Enzyme design. Structure first.
Site, PDB file in Angstrom:
ATOM      1  N   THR A   1       0.839  -1.224   0.000  1.00  0.00           N
ATOM      2  CA  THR A   1       0.000   0.000   0.000  1.00  0.00           C
ATOM      3  C   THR A   1       0.874   1.275   0.000  1.00  0.00           C
ATOM      4  O   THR A   1       0.672   2.215  -0.811  1.00  0.00           O
ATOM      5  CB  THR A   1      -0.909  -0.045   1.249  1.00  0.00           C
ATOM      6  OG1 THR A   1      -1.764  -1.204   1.176  1.00  0.00           O
ATOM      7  CG2 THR A   1      -1.836   1.127   1.345  1.00  0.00           C
ATOM      8  N   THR A   2       1.831   1.302   0.917  1.00  0.00           N
ATOM      9  CA  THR A   2       2.706   2.460   1.133  1.00  0.00           C
ATOM     10  C   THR A   2       3.750   2.571   0.008  1.00  0.00           C
ATOM     11  O   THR A   2       4.310   3.638  -0.233  1.00  0.00           O
ATOM     12  CB  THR A   2       3.400   2.307   2.510  1.00  0.00           C
ATOM     13  OG1 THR A   2       2.408   2.243   3.551  1.00  0.00           O
ATOM     14  CG2 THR A   2       4.226   3.529   2.904  1.00  0.00           C
TER      15      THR A   2
ATOM     16  N   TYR B   1     -13.011  -2.317  -4.832  1.00  0.00           N
ATOM     17  CA  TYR B   1     -14.007  -1.836  -5.805  1.00  0.00           C
ATOM     18  C   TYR B   1     -15.209  -2.765  -6.106  1.00  0.00           C
ATOM     19  O   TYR B   1     -16.385  -2.330  -6.004  1.00  0.00           O
ATOM     20  CB  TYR B   1     -13.322  -1.297  -7.087  1.00  0.00           C
ATOM     21  CG  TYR B   1     -14.244  -0.446  -7.936  1.00  0.00           C
ATOM     22  CD1 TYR B   1     -14.347   0.934  -7.718  1.00  0.00           C
ATOM     23  CD2 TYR B   1     -15.067  -1.021  -8.915  1.00  0.00           C
ATOM     24  CE1 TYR B   1     -15.227   1.722  -8.476  1.00  0.00           C
ATOM     25  CE2 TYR B   1     -15.967  -0.220  -9.689  1.00  0.00           C
ATOM     26  CZ  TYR B   1     -16.017   1.145  -9.458  1.00  0.00           C
ATOM     27  OH  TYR B   1     -16.832   1.964 -10.171  1.00  0.00           O
TER      28      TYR B   1
ATOM     29  N   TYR C   1      -4.714  -9.792   3.543  1.00  0.00           N
ATOM     30  CA  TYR C   1      -4.685  -8.389   3.917  1.00  0.00           C
ATOM     31  C   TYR C   1      -6.116  -7.806   3.855  1.00  0.00           C
ATOM     32  O   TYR C   1      -6.765  -7.851   2.809  1.00  0.00           O
ATOM     33  CB  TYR C   1      -3.686  -7.664   2.997  1.00  0.00           C
ATOM     34  CG  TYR C   1      -3.450  -6.162   3.143  1.00  0.00           C
ATOM     35  CD1 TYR C   1      -3.880  -5.427   4.236  1.00  0.00           C
ATOM     36  CD2 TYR C   1      -2.670  -5.501   2.179  1.00  0.00           C
ATOM     37  CE1 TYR C   1      -3.633  -4.074   4.331  1.00  0.00           C
ATOM     38  CE2 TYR C   1      -2.405  -4.123   2.284  1.00  0.00           C
ATOM     39  CZ  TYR C   1      -2.891  -3.439   3.331  1.00  0.00           C
ATOM     40  OH  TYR C   1      -2.558  -2.139   3.462  1.00  0.00           O
TER      41      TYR C   1
ATOM     42  N   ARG D   1     -10.125   1.020   2.504  1.00  0.00           N
ATOM     43  CA  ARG D   1      -9.567   1.216   1.160  1.00  0.00           C
ATOM     44  C   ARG D   1     -10.278   0.406   0.079  1.00  0.00           C
ATOM     45  O   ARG D   1     -10.263   0.796  -1.081  1.00  0.00           O
ATOM     46  CB  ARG D   1      -8.086   0.809   1.122  1.00  0.00           C
ATOM     47  CG  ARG D   1      -7.130   1.717   1.901  1.00  0.00           C
ATOM     48  CD  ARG D   1      -5.664   1.289   1.772  1.00  0.00           C
ATOM     49  NE  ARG D   1      -4.776   2.116   2.585  1.00  0.00           N
ATOM     50  CZ  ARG D   1      -4.408   3.355   2.308  1.00  0.00           C
ATOM     51  NH1 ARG D   1      -4.793   3.938   1.183  1.00  0.00           N
ATOM     52  NH2 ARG D   1      -3.591   4.019   3.147  1.00  0.00           N
TER      53      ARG D   1
ATOM     54  N   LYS E   1      -2.515  -9.660   7.533  1.00  0.00           N
ATOM     55  CA  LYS E   1      -2.384  -8.255   7.867  1.00  0.00           C
ATOM     56  C   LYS E   1      -3.795  -7.687   8.117  1.00  0.00           C
ATOM     57  O   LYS E   1      -4.596  -7.518   7.187  1.00  0.00           O
ATOM     58  CB  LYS E   1      -1.692  -7.465   6.750  1.00  0.00           C
ATOM     59  CG  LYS E   1      -1.404  -6.008   7.091  1.00  0.00           C
ATOM     60  CD  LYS E   1      -0.797  -5.228   5.920  1.00  0.00           C
ATOM     61  CE  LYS E   1      -0.696  -3.759   6.249  1.00  0.00           C
ATOM     62  NZ  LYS E   1      -0.303  -2.928   5.067  1.00  0.00           N
TER      63      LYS E   1
ATOM     64  N   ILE F   1       2.852  -4.729  10.159  1.00  0.00           N
ATOM     65  CA  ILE F   1       3.361  -4.232   8.872  1.00  0.00           C
ATOM     66  C   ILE F   1       3.121  -2.742   8.898  1.00  0.00           C
ATOM     67  O   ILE F   1       1.973  -2.288   8.827  1.00  0.00           O
ATOM     68  CB  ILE F   1       2.732  -4.969   7.696  1.00  0.00           C
ATOM     69  CG1 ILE F   1       3.225  -6.415   7.673  1.00  0.00           C
ATOM     70  CG2 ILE F   1       3.062  -4.326   6.338  1.00  0.00           C
ATOM     71  CD1 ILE F   1       2.441  -7.320   6.746  1.00  0.00           C
TER      72      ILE F   1
END
Ligand SMILES: [Cl-]
Ligand SMILES: [Cl-]
Ligand SMILES: [Cl-]
Ligand SMILES: [Cl-]
Ligand SMILES: [K+]
Ligand SMILES: [K+]
Ligand SMILES: [K+]
Ligand SMILES: [K+]
EC number: 4.3.3.7
Lengths: 292, 292, 292, 292
Positions: free
Chosen positions: C44-45, C107, C133, C138, C161, C203
């Site tokens: 993500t980051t 989505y 995850y 998000r 995660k 994480i």
């Protein structure tokens, strides 16, 4: 006192909707025998909402008498007008209760400053220890940790019943208050977690019908024996959830009746009798806990 | 009158927190002159929360007395215990009020069946018209359209103050009820939208200080002149929002004081005085509305 | 490996928005020196969102090379089409990465059955260990504990995660999975709590700029030294929060640049440069952590 | 055409998950005959998520080819990386599509400034009309009216598909934009309300199977005949709701298959086949709409 398994005790009623003294006596003996740490009298589960303040006081005083010094009694003292909260609290001054459980004002949605002023004035009109109570889902109001920290500086404000189910509050509040400020779960389903994070106990609906298991679970938790405690928790988890299948205390009153702890499961409007589906749901949960 | 602009009137207080008759008179005269359709007495904005039932009754009787027949008065009669709602309602039997505004029980979170029994019992024991009141952000419960439909079949239950701000509710309710059942916004910021979708009026906080503009906006809306109404709504929108910058009725009482409509902006705890930041916000909104 | 402080590493870029190898090398040396347990590459980051799969793979492979066996590397492999998730994962088969971090489809909001089928097919096309995850804020999708339990029965699905910030998930999942299934926080601000409840690590975004403190905090936690760990946590808490003052990784990239860990704080649209207010906010947090 | 009933068309697939030309032809013929205003090709309901850009382009070109000029086609062009949105848009330059439907970046949760830069850059590099698309439940972000207002000043940005279901958005947007900016519901269940408040049409899932009723409803709404429209809306409401009983487009593809509009109800993972319970729910909704 303000640690371990504290029962949020039902106000058992007769068919007319008035307190049933025989049933109350039975419950208090049960909690004494079961190792329950203390009783919250006429809190949320005690139908504070539908008792007038005279009736409320009568039940508190009767609970105190019947306890006969064998188990500490905390009075529910919440009111959404500060003057009313003071007046109610004053009824119990020099009564024998060991403290008060006082909820954030409901309906009128005060600021954090309003909450601060509310609880501070209340604490100023009594020598009784005060336990704050946060339950936004019922009140429309959320007492945040920072404000808890403010109020913890008041001498007789000594703990909180945290009923959000948001486990992050435990350490947010703990870091802002002194080490003897008491952190009590107000959410049975997350209460063992709450204790694992550093909470000191729970004010419990589940304990009404599974007092011995709850006392043992909290004792294990307090000793750091979290895995052993979880075994008990898993046995009770269906009950932690299904005691809210219909609005509290509809389920738990039916459960008490089914277990023979109370004579009737009568409630006051707008609480209504348990549905057939609700009965079967709660019965299953009691079976899973091995209480039936 | 249960259509148009209905003011959710403040209970003006002196510095001791007691009702200020002279101020209340001024407000009532203002609403008679400004074309307000009716006054809700000791509703949410009227600090029902912090007046006891006797003080509550006094303020309604005074409001009727001062109104002197020139504008209809609806009494706030909500309580979270059904017995207490009935009891409060009886105080206003043959008082001269035109109806009652009765909120869903707060804090105890009844089921839809409990809501049904609550409101049915209340309507049963009076001849007065009853307006149901849904405001989940304050109460912790949500009176759903299905149940509103059930209740609308009670002779006596004649409308709803819908304060969710959820505009889908308008036609969900409308299709379940008769064409004479009154649908009233309880959310100033979305009230014109609510009217455009079929609502009949608004029980308004903003009307406390913008009575004439509110009256005209609601008449234009009732006539289907939405663009014309919306121009007024746009100049009022800062107020619709910023009257809730701090808990209602703190901002609106300050505003009434600033305009000279009331002598003091005093409230009862847990309401606290407006912050300086709040004053500036509210003042700017008053100025955008053309009121200062 | 899959325990302790795992960095969700930024993809440092040049002013053109392409990976900067010198800056990446600097970061990896930093994590090796700081005691970081492992690196998640292009999660993500790492701006997985704005890298194409070729670019993504290039960064993963480059990270692997630069790590030179000194620190384990987990590839981000998420995709909202199952075929794409398989194809991406297949790129890293026999690469040297030690596992994959694969997010719920975003989505398209699949069912729990869709999630099950998605992750199962992915795991079936690889011998690499899979870390699930969950980050509903998000994705629009919430992988529930029960489904985690289903998937934990797949041989190479070995951890999660959990980025909800809902601490109740730790024990809901733990009770449903085997004792070697790994539970990693995906929420810096609640990560120490998550570990106190039985989580095995985090994480972390924070670890990008405070790698040594984070590694120490997780080590203390793993040793049961929670009070000592909290001291570190309190020092980092401003950063846990303010690294999200603007959308991640805008804040943390600026922070890396300010600390001289990367050459530029360049991002790809629709990420935009940090605002002046954001700069000052993050600088304050870095100061509070004693890193500036 | 960017008013009226616009169908969010399914991408009909054979059992291998590849586009079924014969089925697509049948659907397009159906919409030409049924008075649908336009077709959105490879939007949300069109499984944009699981088609790659080349497959995506093919389906749009095929849709144009089959439409053969008889009904306007809008291409779905959303991407969470701005470069990729631009790149996808270029594929449709001079294709014959009448405009593009472009969603807020998903997963990466950009700021309002990032949204502004995203959409501005896209509009800049095409002459095609752009319809913005807000659907926070899918994306994790919320394009707010203020930003819609900023973007509406771009020549090329001509409207919005507002899929929050939050009806206050209609007039918040309308007051910030010109009278030719098109406001389109992206929520079938609240779309008639949305139109009654000032919206110009709907990008509809329900239109896939109730094309003629949707067309008439939208024309009646455009003419101000809301009661007449609402009668149609009431017979369609079960469908507006139950087409989301399982993730879109699972229910609507099954429905199209049941009516014989498409040859198979196959989808791509992570979408999975409809459950038996889902079939029964959807079937009942089809029957309430008079379609079976
Ligand atoms: Cl309680
Ligand atoms: Cl009111
Ligand atoms: Cl990551
Ligand atoms: Cl679409
Ligand atoms: K204290
Ligand atoms: K009626
Ligand atoms: K496994
Ligand atoms: K424009």
């Amino acid at each position: 006192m303000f640690t371990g398994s504290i029962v949020a005790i039902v106000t058992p009623m007769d068919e007319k909707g008035n307190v049933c003294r025989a049933s109350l006596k039975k419950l208090i003996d049960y909690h004494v025998a079961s190792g329950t740490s203390a009783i919250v009298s006429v809190g949320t589960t005690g139908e504070s909402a539908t008792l007038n303040h005279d009736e409320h006081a009568d039940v508190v005083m009767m609970t105190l008498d019947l306890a006969d010094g064998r188990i500490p009694v905390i009075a529910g003292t919440g009111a959404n007008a500060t003057a009313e909260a003071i007046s109610l609290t004053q009824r119990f001054n020099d009564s024998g209760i060991v403290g008060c459980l006082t909820v954030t004002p409901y309906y009128n949605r005060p600021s954090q400053e309003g909450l601060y002023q509310h609880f501070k004035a209340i604490a100023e009109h009594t020598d009784l220890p005060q336990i704050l109570y946060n339950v936004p889902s019922r009140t429309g109001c959320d007492l945040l940790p920072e404000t808890v920290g403010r109020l913890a500086k008041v001498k007789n404000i000594i703990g909180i019943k945290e009923a959000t189910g948001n486990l992050t509050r435990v350490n947010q509040i703990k870091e802002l208050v002194s080490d003897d400020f008491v952190l009590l779960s107000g959410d049975d389903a997350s209460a063992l977690d709450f204790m694992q994070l550093g909470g000191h106990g729970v004010i419990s609906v589940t304990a009404n019908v599974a007092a011995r298991d709850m006392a043992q679970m909290c004792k294990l938790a307090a000793e750091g024996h979290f895995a052993e405690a979880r075994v008990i928790n898993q046995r009770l988890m269906p009950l932690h959830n299904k005691l809210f299948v219909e609005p509290n205390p509809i389920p738990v009153k039916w459960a008490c009746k089914e277990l023979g702890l109370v004579a009737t499961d009568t409630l006051r409007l707008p609480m209504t009798p348990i549905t057939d589906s609700g009965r079967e749901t709660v019965r299953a949960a009691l079976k899973h806990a091995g209480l039936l």
